[PDB]
Design an enzyme around this catalytic site. Structure first.
Site, PDB file in Angstrom:
ATOM      1  N   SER A 225       3.652  66.858  71.838  1.00 33.43           N
ATOM      2  CA  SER A 225       3.095  65.845  72.744  1.00 33.43           C
ATOM      3  C   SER A 225       2.784  64.505  72.068  1.00 33.43           C
ATOM      4  O   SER A 225       2.385  63.580  72.781  1.00 33.43           O
ATOM      5  CB  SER A 225       1.802  66.330  73.386  1.00 33.43           C
ATOM      6  OG  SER A 225       2.031  67.397  74.295  1.00 33.43           O
TER       7      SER A 225
ATOM      8  N   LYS B 229       4.670  61.590  73.584  1.00 32.28           N
ATOM      9  CA  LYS B 229       4.181  60.893  74.762  1.00 32.28           C
ATOM     10  C   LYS B 229       3.850  59.424  74.474  1.00 32.28           C
ATOM     11  O   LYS B 229       3.989  58.601  75.375  1.00 32.28           O
ATOM     12  CB  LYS B 229       2.989  61.619  75.415  1.00 32.28           C
ATOM     13  CG  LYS B 229       3.236  63.051  75.922  1.00 32.28           C
ATOM     14  CD  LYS B 229       2.117  63.579  76.863  1.00 32.28           C
ATOM     15  CE  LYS B 229       2.239  65.076  77.186  1.00 32.28           C
ATOM     16  NZ  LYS B 229       3.551  65.616  76.724  1.00 32.28           N
TER      17      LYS B 229
ATOM     18  N   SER C 272      -2.656  65.384  78.286  1.00 31.11           N
ATOM     19  CA  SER C 272      -1.380  65.778  77.725  1.00 31.11           C
ATOM     20  C   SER C 272      -0.510  66.522  78.764  1.00 31.11           C
ATOM     21  O   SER C 272       0.164  67.538  78.491  1.00 31.11           O
ATOM     22  CB  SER C 272      -1.642  66.577  76.441  1.00 31.11           C
ATOM     23  OG  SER C 272      -0.499  66.481  75.581  1.00 31.11           O
TER      24      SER C 272
ATOM     25  N   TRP D  31       0.676  70.031  70.287  1.00 27.58           N
ATOM     26  CA  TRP D  31       0.687  71.463  69.989  1.00 27.58           C
ATOM     27  C   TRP D  31       2.034  71.969  70.462  1.00 27.58           C
ATOM     28  O   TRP D  31       2.242  72.022  71.668  1.00 27.58           O
ATOM     29  CB  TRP D  31      -0.421  72.183  70.761  1.00 27.58           C
ATOM     30  CG  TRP D  31      -0.586  73.620  70.360  1.00 27.58           C
ATOM     31  CD1 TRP D  31       0.314  74.439  69.715  1.00 27.58           C
ATOM     32  CD2 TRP D  31      -1.755  74.415  70.613  1.00 27.58           C
ATOM     33  NE1 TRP D  31      -0.232  75.697  69.565  1.00 27.58           N
ATOM     34  CE2 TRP D  31      -1.501  75.705  70.091  1.00 27.58           C
ATOM     35  CE3 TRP D  31      -3.004  74.144  71.213  1.00 27.58           C
ATOM     36  CZ2 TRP D  31      -2.458  76.723  70.141  1.00 27.58           C
ATOM     37  CZ3 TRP D  31      -3.943  75.156  71.283  1.00 27.58           C
ATOM     38  CH2 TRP D  31      -3.676  76.420  70.725  1.00 27.58           C
TER      39      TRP D  31
ATOM     40  N   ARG E 288      -8.313  70.709  65.912  1.00 24.73           N
ATOM     41  CA  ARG E 288      -7.581  69.547  65.414  1.00 24.73           C
ATOM     42  C   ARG E 288      -8.521  68.352  65.304  1.00 24.73           C
ATOM     43  O   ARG E 288      -8.544  67.676  64.268  1.00 24.73           O
ATOM     44  CB  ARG E 288      -6.302  69.223  66.209  1.00 24.73           C
ATOM     45  CG  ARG E 288      -5.290  70.366  66.227  1.00 24.73           C
ATOM     46  CD  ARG E 288      -4.257  70.184  67.335  1.00 24.73           C
ATOM     47  NE  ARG E 288      -5.011  70.185  68.588  1.00 24.73           N
ATOM     48  CZ  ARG E 288      -4.445  70.053  69.765  1.00 24.73           C
ATOM     49  NH1 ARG E 288      -3.143  69.815  69.850  1.00 24.73           N
ATOM     50  NH2 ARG E 288      -5.197  70.057  70.843  1.00 24.73           N
TER      51      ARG E 288
HETATM   52  C1  LIG Z   1       1.931  68.789  73.832  1.00 23.69           C
HETATM   53  O1  LIG Z   1       1.970  68.958  72.618  1.00 23.69           O
HETATM   54  C2  LIG Z   1       1.829  69.993  74.789  1.00 23.69           C
HETATM   55  C3  LIG Z   1       0.422  69.969  75.377  1.00 23.69           C
HETATM   56  N1  LIG Z   1      -0.451  69.319  74.426  1.00 23.69           N
HETATM   57  C4  LIG Z   1      -1.653  69.900  74.395  1.00 23.69           C
HETATM   58  C5  LIG Z   1      -2.626  69.395  73.425  1.00 23.69           C
HETATM   59  O2  LIG Z   1      -2.193  68.562  72.546  1.00 23.69           O
HETATM   60  O3  LIG Z   1      -3.788  69.860  73.435  1.00 23.69           O
HETATM   61  C6  LIG Z   1      -1.687  71.013  75.140  1.00 23.69           C
HETATM   62  S1  LIG Z   1      -2.993  72.060  75.401  1.00 23.69           S
HETATM   63  C7  LIG Z   1      -3.309  71.940  77.139  1.00 23.69           C
HETATM   64  C8  LIG Z   1      -3.859  70.545  77.446  1.00 23.69           C
HETATM   65  N2  LIG Z   1      -5.216  70.682  77.998  1.00 23.69           N
HETATM   66  C9  LIG Z   1      -5.507  72.133  78.136  1.00 23.69           C
HETATM   67  C10 LIG Z   1      -6.746  72.533  77.377  1.00 23.69           C
HETATM   68  O4  LIG Z   1      -7.349  73.483  77.875  1.00 23.69           O
HETATM   69  N3  LIG Z   1      -7.134  71.856  76.241  1.00 23.69           N
HETATM   70  C11 LIG Z   1      -6.576  72.102  74.886  1.00 23.69           C
HETATM   71  C12 LIG Z   1      -8.189  70.815  76.272  1.00 23.69           C
HETATM   72  C13 LIG Z   1      -4.350  72.954  77.593  1.00 23.69           C
HETATM   73  C14 LIG Z   1      -0.321  71.278  75.689  1.00 23.69           C
HETATM   74  C15 LIG Z   1       0.357  72.474  75.011  1.00 23.69           C
HETATM   75  C16 LIG Z   1       2.790  69.786  75.947  1.00 23.69           C
HETATM   76  C17 LIG Z   1       4.250  69.596  75.566  1.00 23.69           C
HETATM   77  O5  LIG Z   1       2.792  71.009  76.655  1.00 23.69           O
END
Ligand SMILES: *C(=O)[C@@H]([C@@H]1NC(C(=O)O)=C(S[C@@H]2CN[C@H](C(=O)N(C)C)C2)[C@@H]1C)[C@@H](C)O
Length: 244
Positions: free
Chosen positions: A50, A53, A97, A190, A230
């Protein structure tokens, strides 16, 4: 007055204590400093996940595929996470994200323009392959932690080859924390469908006096790690070094 041996030890221990392997790169002016418990990661290539982005938004906004107040509607289909099941701006999507919005934006840009722009800015290995909406997840686009921190440094100082206004609009999307008159701008990442999995947090600190200190954390994520490890390793590292 704290020794560099002590700084190196404390930051190594933050990665050791999260039971992970990782590096955090800091750049002050032109000087790169590498810390953590896996220094050799600094020049190894990983999927950007991500973090891409930030460049997807620059490209989309520069090429008029979206504006900063346009609402990308949820199409009503189930999304991996319930918080993505709503309508959002590129900005909101940046903070959550939300991949579906960024996938839609990539499809508006289209494969040909995307390839030309990713080559133009020189991002990572610059290869996006033939699928405009997944190249940042499982390959073939890869980038090193050194390259990510240099990208963040470029964006922080408006040095990328896009208009000044495009860069500022993207930067406004990336504010994640304010800590003692310091502002932290970053994008997390991630990559869950690569093995091992990769975690990123790349951005910069804007200090009260106006100086910007870019960083890039890169680690191995393991099942049942919280994403917020992170942020925590990053804030602890920047605080240990007195950057915030
Ligand atoms: C990007 O890398 C993937 C998404 N990025 C993130 C991230 O960087 O945290 C997530 S986790 C997703 C986002 N918010 C939810 C949560 O509960 N938290 C971590 C706050 C879950 C994704 C995997 C994208 C390509 O999918």
């Amino acid at each position: 007055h704290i020794s560099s041996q002590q700084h190196e030890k404390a930051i190594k221990s933050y990665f050791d204590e999260a039971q992970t392997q990782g590096v955090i790169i800091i750049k002050e002016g032109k000087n790169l400093s590498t810390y953590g418990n896996a220094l050799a990661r600094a020049n190894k290539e990983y999927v950007p996940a991500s973090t891409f982005k930030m460049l997807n938004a620059l490209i989309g906004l520069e090429n008029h595929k979206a504006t900063t107040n346009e609402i990308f509607k949820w199409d009503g289909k189930k999304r991996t996470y319930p918080m993505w099941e709503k309508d959002m701006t590129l900005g909101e999507a940046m903070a959550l994200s939300a991949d579906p919005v960024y996938q839609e934006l990539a499809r508006r840009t289209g494969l040909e323009l995307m390839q030309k722009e990713v080559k133009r800015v020189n991002f990572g290995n610059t290869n996006i392959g033939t699928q405009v909406d997944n190249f940042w997840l499982v390959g073939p686009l890869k980038i090193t932690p050194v390259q990510e921190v240099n990208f963040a440094d470029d964006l922080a100082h408006n040095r990328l080859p896009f208009k000044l206004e495009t860069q500022e609009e993207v930067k406004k999307m990336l504010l994640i924390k304010e800590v003692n008159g310091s502002k932290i701008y970053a994008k997390s990442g991630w990559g869950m469908g690569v093995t091992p999995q990769v975690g990123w947090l790349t951005g910069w600190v804007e200090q009260a006096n106006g100086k910007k200190i870019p960083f890039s954390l890169n680690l191995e994520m393991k099942e049942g790690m919280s994403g917020s490890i992170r942020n925590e390793i990053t804030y602890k590292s920047l605080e240990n070094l007195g950057i915030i």
